[PDB]
Amino acid sequence: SQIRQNYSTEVEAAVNRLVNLYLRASYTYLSLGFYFDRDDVALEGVCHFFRELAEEKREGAERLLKMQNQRGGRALFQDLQKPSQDEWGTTLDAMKAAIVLEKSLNQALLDLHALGSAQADPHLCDFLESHFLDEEVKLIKKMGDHLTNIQRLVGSQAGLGEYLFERLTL
Amino acid sequence: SQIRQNYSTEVEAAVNRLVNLYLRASYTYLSLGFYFDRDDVALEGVCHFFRELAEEKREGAERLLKMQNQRGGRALFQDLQKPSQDEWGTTLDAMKAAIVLEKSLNQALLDLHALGSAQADPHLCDFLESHFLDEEVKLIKKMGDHLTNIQRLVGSQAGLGEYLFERLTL
Amino acid sequence: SQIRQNYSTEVEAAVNRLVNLYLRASYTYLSLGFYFDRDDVALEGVCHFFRELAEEKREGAERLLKMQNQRGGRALFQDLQKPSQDEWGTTLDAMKAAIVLEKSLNQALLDLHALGSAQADPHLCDFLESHFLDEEVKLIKKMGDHLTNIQRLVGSQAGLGEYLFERLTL
Amino acid sequence: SQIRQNYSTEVEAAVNRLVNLYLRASYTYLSLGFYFDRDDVALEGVCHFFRELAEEKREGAERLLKMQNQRGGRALFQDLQKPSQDEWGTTLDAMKAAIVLEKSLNQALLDLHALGSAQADPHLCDFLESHFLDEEVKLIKKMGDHLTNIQRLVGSQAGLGEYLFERLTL
Amino acid sequence: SQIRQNYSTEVEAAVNRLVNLYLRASYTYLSLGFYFDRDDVALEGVCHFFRELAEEKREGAERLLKMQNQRGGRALFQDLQKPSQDEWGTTLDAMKAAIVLEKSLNQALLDLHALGSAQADPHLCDFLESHFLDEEVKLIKKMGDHLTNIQRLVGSQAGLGEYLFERLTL
């Protein structure tokens, strides 16, 4: 690549893999989104929360491919593994599943950051600082907040709490 | 009729009958509407949901008579049978009664569609596709959603749930 | 009924019956409306006159049910008898049929008024004065005017007169 | 009185007495209003409902005195009896107390109406029809609705229901 | 054709033929239009009715050729047969001639629809449903209405009726 400068094939492969992790998450959020939209689930606020997250993840993916091309790296796409469940249970279960997903998305970003530090790729680290690290952190505290709120409303009347959470916070 | 073309007396009679089914539904929705408006029921959101549906049904009826005249068919009106209950019970019971009504309204439309296919009346089918099939489908998923939400809020505290459903979703 | 005050079961039953008379009239005006819309009748001004009256009648009906609920009375709906003709003849015949209908609607209102006076229900009478008595009176003089005009234009050339009446007054 | 015409001293005295009944109700609604405003009651929606009713009642009073002067009658004011309770209990109790008050205000109006009919005072009856009969009827159905809603939310969790009613309907 | 998919040479030839039927109708409506514009006919409302229909028909033709190209079919144009009369008689005769034309245009569309059904060309049928079936139906009821109106005004004074129809409905 005539424009490739200080872009180790190590960081190239790691950004291809987190590109896949990000499209995989966007795929899972789509499954969650359409399950809270099921006639027998009917939590339109929860479906709307996961549909927005499926798009935020696709966009992280495109941002990472755009950056891969900018550094002269080559996008290599892998098969997208299907969501890991077909039905998500209640909003609590769905909320817990999503924050596992974001924390593993976040640990993948932290790993790429450390990889950019070993290889001394200031542009790569400055990239993950601006557009991914802060976003994941805000998203996970946001989901931890929702989880704490759903857990407090779920103690006694679950149906009522799930309805109230969907109606009052989402 | 000087303008009647490919309009079988079979589809004529079937559209007169679904015209009646549609005015009958509009009549039932009026009864439901005024029952949630009773001083001892007082669920103004539920009364407002059924008053709007009584008008959506009257308008399907007029749309069908307008189309009957456009094809040169002759409107023949029958006595409108009275709603099948005087008091509707709770919002759950009323919601379940309405979706029976919409599904039988929808099966009547599907029957007319099949009748338009046997007789090869592309204009009649294109008509029921545009203005009735999609509308019934959206309406029934909308009512299935409400039912799932009322059933989840009704498990423990029914009074509270009925109040919350009426206040938060309608 | 915890809010029912000075609302005799006599006036309750009489308002349920005039509610039916009003939905019945709205049904008849719908039949008249769709008959002047027939391809072989084609008097769009006459169809438009009777479609507007079918809605004015439905609204009297809803006004009466709204008032029945306000006084703590219970709406009881009866089967709606079908219009009393399928084809209405000429605009003259249709106009004469409508004013019979309005005058019997008006005599039903006058009867309910007398019933509200025997039982001393100032709220019921004040109600029929504001929203029905004046409306019927204006409507019947309006129809008597149309009848006098159609009869004057119908003497010699009927086709021409019917066309002119529909074109110039409706 | 040089302008007094067909204004029986019977209707004069009865309008002076309903003027007192109306200032008395306005006084009671003020007491209810300030009790839901107490730091240990704190239901600002209920306090706001009764403060608005205390003013609607004062204005009925002024309307009646204005009409008494218009007919040449003489306002005679009596001592205003104090509200009949100092603390109103819960919103349910307060709501039940208010609708007793409105129904006795309404029966006082109906009595004055009958009195205006015996003495044949068309102006007096036309007056109570326009500004009091309809208002009381709408107000009592409004309070019957609130009572039905508070009673449904009060079955199990009372604190929660009282909070929800005040937050969602008032 | 590299883009031709499921487009039978049967439907190709049938759309070329209805393209011709549509340009032929547009040609006939042009002849009718210029005949009501003749100094010795002078019915500018009737000339304006047929000039607008000559353009609506040309546009159906272009819509059909545009669709033929979209499916990869090949437009094949045939000689346009001249209108079938040079003088159209009265507005009644001209109106009757036009509705024969529209009904045969409509039966040609219904035939193409059946042809699209045998060959299972959902795109072709969905095409004729959206842009031709509904249009022809509305147009023929519109012409049946005009015919009923002209026939009613033509009974006695024909000159007067023809003038009035042209002045009041067109």
Author numbering:
A (entry chain G), B (entry chain F), C (entry chain A), D (entry chain X), E (entry chain B): 2 to 171
Please give sentences taken from the publication describing this entry.
The reconstruction reached 2.1-Å resolution (0.143 Fourier shell correlation [FSC]) from 41,202 particles with standard data collection and processing. The resolution of the reconstructed map, which is equivalent to the highest reported to date for this specimen, but required about half as many data, is demonstrated by clear densities for side chains in the map. This includes complete aspartate and glutamate residues, for which densities beyond the Cβ are often absent from EM maps. The decay rate of high-resolution information with fluence after the first 5–10 e−/Å2 of irradiation in this dataset is similar to measurements of radiation damage in 2D protein crystals. Adding a graphene layer to an all-gold support reduced particle movement by a factor of 2 during electron irradiation. Compared with graphene-on-carbon supports, graphene-on-gold supports reduced particle movement by a factor of 3. Importantly, besides reducing the rate of random (uncorrelated) particle motion, the addition of the graphene layer also reduces the movement during the first few electrons of irradiation, improving the quality (B-factor) of these initial frames, in which the molecules are less damaged by the beam. We posit that the twofold reduction in the initial movement of the particles in ice is due to the graphene layer restricting the bulk movement of the thin film of ice within each hole.
Here we used a modified form of graphene, in conjunction with a stable grid made of gold, to control these surface effects. Functionalized graphene-on-gold grids improve the reliability of specimen preparation and enhance image quality. To address this problem we developed a method to produce multifunctional and ultrastable graphene supports with tunable surface properties for cryoEM. To demonstrate that these supports are suitable for high-resolution structure determination, we used an amylamine-functionalized graphene on gold support to determine the structure of horse spleen apoferritin.
